[PDB]
Design a protein around this ligand. Structure first.
Ligand code: NAG
Ligand code: NAG
Ligand code: NAG
Lengths: 99, 50
């Protein structure tokens, strides 16, 4: 969530030093209106651009009115990738980032 | 791009990525079966590997 009222872009990377494969998990939040977007993330239009040697994936959120499941209408789509040894996964997001 | 049986728009996904063959930018290629007497209409203002 933004600190103060500011959400800087999340420039993060991780080299899989472990010669053993690595399952890196993250997700994207889908708020139920732009008010919930602004309440959590000051940037209205946001993205999640992840990238590895064998991945290229930009994920915009999907704001839509939705039915309440577990007493919560907003959704959260989770993703996964097998990070090979000596391969870096570079996260680059300005909102909705379930890091 | 568009044909009789195709409809796709493709924004480029800019993202920081690992180097492969000394270059970290990617290039996703596509293919389509263009039937006889059928036109494929390309319409891009960028990133078009024609
Ligand atoms: C934090 O929020 C207040 C709100 O009045 C603002 O004045 C201030 O400049 C902000 N900056 C930080 C990081 O404290
Ligand atoms: C770190 O990741 C890069 C790809 O981003 C890879 O080329 C390199 O071999 C990895 N390991 C080291 C020790 O640099
Ligand atoms: C050229 O393609 C169109 C569809 O885009 C088709 O209707 C037409 O018959 C094709 N060629 C000609 C000159 O007949």
């Amino acid at each position: 969530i933004k600190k103060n009222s500011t959400y800087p872009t999340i420039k993060r990377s991780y080299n899989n030093t472990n010669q053993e494969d690595l399952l890196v998990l993250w997700g994207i939040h889908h708020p139920n209106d732009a008010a919930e977007q602004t309440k959590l993330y000051q940037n209205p239009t946001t993205y999640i651009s992840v990238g590895t040697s064998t991945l290229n994936q930009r994920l915009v959120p999907r704001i839509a009115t939705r039915s309440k499941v577990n007493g919560q209408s907003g959704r959260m789509e989770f993703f996964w990738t097998i990070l090979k040894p000596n391969d870096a996964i570079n996260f680059e997001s300005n909102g909705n980032f379930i890091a």
